[PDB]
Design a protein around this ligand. Structure first.
Ligand SMILES: CCN(CC)S(=O)(=O)c1ccc(O)c(NC(=O)c2[nH]c(C)c3c2CCCCC3=O)c1
Length: 127
């Protein structure tokens, strides 16, 4: 099996804007998670060819990773902060769907998700 193409990160047909919530998601939320000890399995799409996981994209039909989210923020792909929060939540849910309790990658996801939730509790005010 091939890997699927990664998620779209730029779309010329979508309107663009900057907002303080989007700035905060990139320059505070994403940045904090990106540097975390446990972030590396989440920094790029799962390469199921290289890792020989041919069932990964038979189970996970909405793949997402922080590399894609970073590119989406940097390309102004999101209009609403909740779109970006939704992608982080998809990334974590995909981990819990594919993996078992007790697995290392689940412990890693749980720690990142805890930190993610703490950081988005401090999202600044909407315009
Ligand atoms: C091939 C890339 N590598 C060499 C260039 S690698 O980045 O060094 C590397 C090396 C060993 C690895 O197990 C990984 N695993 C992951 O990334 C990863 N992420 C997630 C969210 C998952 C997995 C795999 C476990 C099960 C599925 C899952 O939920 C990555």
């Amino acid at each position: 099996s091939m890997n699927p193409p990664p998620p779209e990160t730029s779309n010329p047909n979508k309107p663009k804007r900057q907002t303080n919530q989007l700035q905060y998601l990139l320059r505070v939320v994403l940045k904090t998670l990106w540097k975390h000890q446990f972030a590396w399995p989440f920094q790029q799409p799962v390469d199921a060819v290289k890792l020989n996981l041919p069932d990964y994209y038979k189970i996970i039909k909405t793949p997402m990773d922080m590399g894609t989210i970073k590119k989406r923020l940097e390309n102004n792909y999101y209009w609403n902060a909740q779109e970006c929060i939704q992608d982080f939540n998809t990334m974590f849910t995909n981990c819990y769907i594919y993996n078992k309790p007790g697995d290392d990658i689940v412990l890693m996801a749980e720690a990142l998700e805890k930190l993610f939730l703490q950081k988005i509790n401090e999202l600044p005010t909407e315009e």
